[PDB]
Write a protein that binds this ligand. Structure first.
Ligand SMILES: *C(=O)[C@H](C[C@@H]1CCNC1=O)NC(=O)[C@H](CC(C)C)NC(=O)OC[C@@H]1C[C@H]1CCC
Ligand SMILES: *C(=O)[C@H](C[C@@H]1CCNC1=O)NC(=O)[C@H](CC(C)C)NC(=O)OC[C@@H]1C[C@H]1CCC
Lengths: 302, 302
């Protein structure tokens, strides 16, 4: 039986209309054009010989407005430039007539967002990721993808949360929030960096087990229960996130009649092993679907 | 190590601009507006009391142009109506000014396409599926999603291949090509229908094993080899598709230095069991990524 779950992204058209190419010196990547502002990673200013230890303050000082070439696939004339953290803010002489309603927000571990992967200012694909507990994402990014953006959507308002910066040695990816901070402890320098341990996102595993029940698959449900406080002690010793329930999870508990604490017990047992059984076609725990995903895709509830 | 593979969809903006709502009688679903034509499922004409055995020919005869209300979220006046297989072709008085370059094609088992899930003519999400060997897709569709479209893209040309019609008893989905045929032996009637067996898509499993090698994961590669002819005999007795190599697979063989026949042998052994080992984080064969996916996402080759 098919779960009815897929990796679902927001329709990308509103964001596609905001993507531009930014070129400075020998570097070319993508930017995001909102109102009279183009956002892009600051390493567009870096020569190749300096990607491992750029002096971004001195590079910024060395640039003029004319150093930055911005093109939509129109040329946008840059009339101001500034640095915010790991991002540049370029002011351009034309306001984007296709600027959506938007905000900037930071995404939290375990939460999902949509990514528009772009090369040379041209959108090429879209996909959805969950921010991992170690502030990486398991994406699909190649050379030239920096400045690709991640976002969520509330109503007609696009909430931009991610601008792509780099790949880590283990193949995962990270980037910046639009306040200019990098996610996690990462730095926008091309050197090897410590990577914190990833963890299973407990609240998302709970969501997936609820998805299993909603699809008629509940062999792992027993009357046994583990409290949130006890689970969270256990989680710390077993590479799980601490569980924090939400109204979205509560709706799944109501719809199925299975209590959260029953599934926290199940997770503890399933972690030791599935004993040859499958859950929604898998023999390992799944933490890449959120409670909101399950509520929306299976229950039709946004 | 992260594979660098994600479920990647085409940017959806070009298709979003083509979606409309179609209402007839008591039914409302989505349509696709290209030039002066709106395509939609013919069961928009059906009353609820007749969804299990509609007489579509008599329903069509009973309709006038004014029976069909088409809205973009503009009202499009219907000036002609016709039935092609399981689809209606409504002629409207306004050509879509945002009509992309497009063709209609039929997708084949194992091939991937992008879906724009729409409700009431409003795009709500996008995802990618592979057409299964039994002509179903493992999608995410709820009431009101009919008329949602699937497509591939070659250059700037959108190749529409799927218009959503129904969910099967096992939770999978199927629909129509734009020649009006349903995929497989399915009928657009709300009754239980035979479902052919699904099968592992051998060419996609081969692609995924190549993806593993490209990521440094090659423990399953041995000098042992199975020929395509011998594998295909085996496949018939073991619920695999017969393997047909392509230039896309050949590029993966060149890049990795591992022959196709080595991976056909591997598949035979892995099917009996992974013996506790993992491949790209999985303990079962993966057939939802194509050779083209691997070439594009990992090798940057379209
Ligand atoms: C920007 O387009 C690019 C995106 C990156 C390249 C390959 N896949 C990707 O997602 N970013 C970088 O190349 C980045 C630049 C620095 C100055 C932030 N460096 C980088 O990603 O290095 C990748 C290799 C694995 C790491 C080894 C030590 C850093
Ligand atoms: C059209 O919006 C709708 C889409 C379907 C509903 C729930 N999830 C979906 O993808 N299509 C139908 O409802 C379809 C109409 C007929 C006339 C083609 N019927 C249908 O999908 O039935 C679903 C239930 C499982 C099957 C049982 C016997 C048919």
């Amino acid at each position: 039986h098919h779960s009815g779950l897929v990796k679902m992204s927001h329709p990308s058209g509103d964001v596609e209309a905001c993507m531009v190419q930014v070129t400075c010196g020998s570097m070319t990547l993508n930017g995001l054009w909102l109102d009279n502002t183009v956002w892009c990673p600051r390493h567009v200013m870096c020569p190749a010989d300096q990607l491992s230890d750029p002096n971004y303050d001195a590079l910024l000082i060395s640039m003029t407005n004319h150093s930055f070439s911005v093109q939509k696939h129109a040329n946008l004339r840059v009339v101001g430039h500034a640095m915010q953290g790991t991002l540049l803010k370029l002011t351009v002489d034309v306001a984007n007539p296709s600027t959506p309603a938007y905000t900037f927000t930071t995404v939290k571990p375990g939460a999902a967002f949509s990514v528009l992967a772009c090369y040379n200012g041209r959108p090429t694909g879209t996909f959805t990721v969950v921010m991992r507990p170690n502030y990486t994402i398991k994406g699909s990014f190649l050379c030239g993808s920096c400045g690709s953006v991640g976002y969520t959507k509330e109503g007609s308002v696009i909430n931009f949360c991610y601008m792509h910066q780099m790949e880590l040695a283990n193949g995962t990816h990270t980037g910046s929030a639009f306040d200019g901070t990098m996610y996690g402890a990462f730095m926008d320098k091309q050197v090897h960096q410590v990577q914190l341990t990833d963890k299973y996102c407990s609240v998302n595993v709970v969501a997936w087990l609820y998805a299993a029940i909603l699809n008629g698959c509940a062999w792992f449900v027993k009357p046994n229960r583990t409290s949130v406080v006890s689970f969270n002690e256990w989680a710390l010793a077993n590479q799980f996130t601490e569980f924090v329930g939400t109204q979205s999870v509560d709706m799944l508990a109501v719809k199925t009649g299975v209590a959260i604490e029953q599934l926290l017990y199940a997770i503890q047992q399933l972690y030791t092993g599935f004993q040859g059984k499958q859950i929604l076609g898998s023999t390992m725990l799944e933490d890449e679907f959120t409670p909101e995903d399950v509520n929306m895709q299976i229950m039709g509830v946004v």
